[PDB]
Design a protein around this ligand. Sequence first.
Ligand SMILES: Cc1c(C(=O)C2=C(O)CCCC2=O)ccc2c1c(=O)n(Cc1ccccc1)c(=O)n2C
Ligand SMILES: Cc1c(C(=O)C2=C(O)CCCC2=O)ccc2c1c(=O)n(Cc1ccccc1)c(=O)n2C
Ligand SMILES: [Co+2]
Ligand SMILES: [Co+2]
Lengths: 380, 380
Amino acid sequence: KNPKSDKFKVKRFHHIEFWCGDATNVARRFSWGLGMRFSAKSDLSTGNMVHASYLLTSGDLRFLFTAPYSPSLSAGEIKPTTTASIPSFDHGSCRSFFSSHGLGVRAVAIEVEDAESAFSISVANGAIPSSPPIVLNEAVTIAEVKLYGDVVLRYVSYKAEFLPGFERVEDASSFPLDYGIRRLDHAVGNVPELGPALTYVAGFTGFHQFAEFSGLNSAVLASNDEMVLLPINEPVHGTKRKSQIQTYLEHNEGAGLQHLALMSEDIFRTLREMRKRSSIGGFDFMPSPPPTYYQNLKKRVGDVLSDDQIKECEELGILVDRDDQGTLLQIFTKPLGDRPTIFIEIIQRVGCMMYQSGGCGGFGKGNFSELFKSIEEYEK
Amino acid sequence: KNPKSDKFKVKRFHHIEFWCGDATNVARRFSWGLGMRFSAKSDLSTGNMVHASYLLTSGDLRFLFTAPYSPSLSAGEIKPTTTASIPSFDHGSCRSFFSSHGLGVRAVAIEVEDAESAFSISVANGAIPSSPPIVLNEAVTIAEVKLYGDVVLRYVSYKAEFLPGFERVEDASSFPLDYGIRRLDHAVGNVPELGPALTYVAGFTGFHQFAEFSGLNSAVLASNDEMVLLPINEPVHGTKRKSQIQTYLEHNEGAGLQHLALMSEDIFRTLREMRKRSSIGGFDFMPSPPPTYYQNLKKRVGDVLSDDQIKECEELGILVDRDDQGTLLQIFTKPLGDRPTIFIEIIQRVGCMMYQSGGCGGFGKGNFSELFKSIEEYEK
Ligand SMILES: Cc1c(C(=O)C2=C(O)CCCC2=O)ccc2c1c(=O)n(Cc1ccccc1)c(=O)n2C
Ligand SMILES: Cc1c(C(=O)C2=C(O)CCCC2=O)ccc2c1c(=O)n(Cc1ccccc1)c(=O)n2C
Ligand SMILES: [Co+2]
Ligand SMILES: [Co+2]
């Protein structure tokens, strides 16, 4: 069931902003490891004495990497005469963020029709304001409320090139890499208590629980057309294996986002390209499933994927789940940085054509039991 | 003239340690951009709850990348029961360093016969102690004194695998990249006043001024066999163009190291490999000289390099200087990180065979006037 209770008009995921201490080095690692292009910058070259910001794009996916300069560069400035292109930025908050959390996402941004309305309605509905609505160059409105931990939900709205004050990267500095990734599918937070976190963010968005049929307990909030998908996990204590959610909270110094799931139009090409670059600057992937997993996949998705295709999934380590309505292909990278905190999921969904409806196939929770049982079988 | 006034027995450059906020991402960018191998680690996987440290190697060159974890991970520890593998490390100093300076080198390490002697003699001769001598696993001794800014000179000495507590990276995680780079040639500091900085570090090392035949004023300190080369610059104010030294001090928040010069056994192969990767995660190079430069190189090094070779230098943008005793091939990357601070120089030296004697060819100071005049000619 979908009550379509969105309290304001939301469109799509717009961009993800990482806060780091050196934007250049994270951005170039990410661009090579993921096949994202260098498309827009805001930094000293563009008259910004406050922060360094570099945008990577693959299809509709927008990764923003931001780090502070020395405050001495902008010490004469005040907020009305700032040279920062993102007005919510703050040296102290950014430096506090990176040194408390290590590398991670500071903002999950969604495009809305009216970011000032979206902010007002949100705050009026219990959201903790983080940055008030600012109109950039009479063209773009930007507002931030608190989401969880030190992560903020960022509303952007356009009257009619990323943001005012970003210049387009000169073609000789922009190499057209592409491994297949096309858009952000979902962004997942880890919190210590799911209940209050659910009722807080559902309370100011009007997002509804998405029907989702060892480790955690979770639930997924979804906008009206279920294209903005915001899962949230909490740990399940007292087990035998320590919950990854609890390890996350311990190493992250509290609540934050666990993973970004990126949609590829061809998860097979994507993972071939990403695996080729794993050990030369790219990303590592979590260990593969035991062949007992793939020896049981023919019994479950043999109607969706052929024998050659299922064997292909065995090569790249791709996991496969399926809904009552769709099939899901997924795989998890190792953590993106020093700490065992944030990671990336590559996915592709099969089915639910009307366009594809959001969340087709679910989120892979079955692959936990498919993995445990598959481990037992291989042990033999 | 070489008085050989070293006050203790120094061997070679041993390693360079970068302090950052995320070691993983800087290390992987550096390894791809420079062709260095992932050879040793100390981190959570190795029982180190204090800091994450990853060593990259190309020939004899050792780049160490270190970042702090959350202090909460090691809050029960005291200095005698620490799990840090580098005992001089300090969460507060590291976080203060990265947030004051951005990405940069924290330590220039040199191997000595006796690091405890080297420390004692040094401090007794005016060096400001930074970390006292610690004997690691009855095998390695490590000591630090202050060099300039927040950069420390690091003495290491071996009785007879990098340091105790680093494990060797498993071969499947270690891809044998190599673009030709073989050793560190020199490490250069920018300070606000050369005089006091020279007399301070020459005072506790006994290093002598190396005979070196617009922008800065510099001088080079050298050990007995002139293989540990420590140039130092200060700005030349009141000019027309703002000194790069002064820009460095402004954006770095004070004194620090300006550049690392890495020796390649084949600067032509190195720069082809590095340029191939510039726009896909590697390093950019400073803009090339006007062809008027290369149209005048035949008049100067036509005895050392052939017509095909000089044209090759024109392709990769390599500059060429020469001593009274040797020839120098060199080129400068763009800054390694967000700030216009530290950068890397690739070099190869021709001549002075006895082995090659250190510093053969000088350091390229002529290429300033060769560049200005070459610009004037091309302007025409
Ligand atoms: C992250 C994730 C998801 C899913 O994406 C997420 C929630 O599960 C549910 C709510 C939102 C939804 O998006 C699904 C399956 C997963 C993983 C995952 O990280 N791993 C790695 C791992 C295995 C053992 C120990 C530690 C880690 C898996 O094996 N499976 C099977
Ligand atoms: C760094 C360096 C060196 C040399 O290595 C260093 C000192 O000069 C002297 C002491 C130690 C010695 O190692 C030599 C030549 C250089 C550069 C250099 O960075 N550039 C870039 C640039 C050009 C215009 C404006 C800003 C930067 C050059 O053009 N030339 C020619
Ligand atoms: Co997911
Ligand atoms: Co140099």
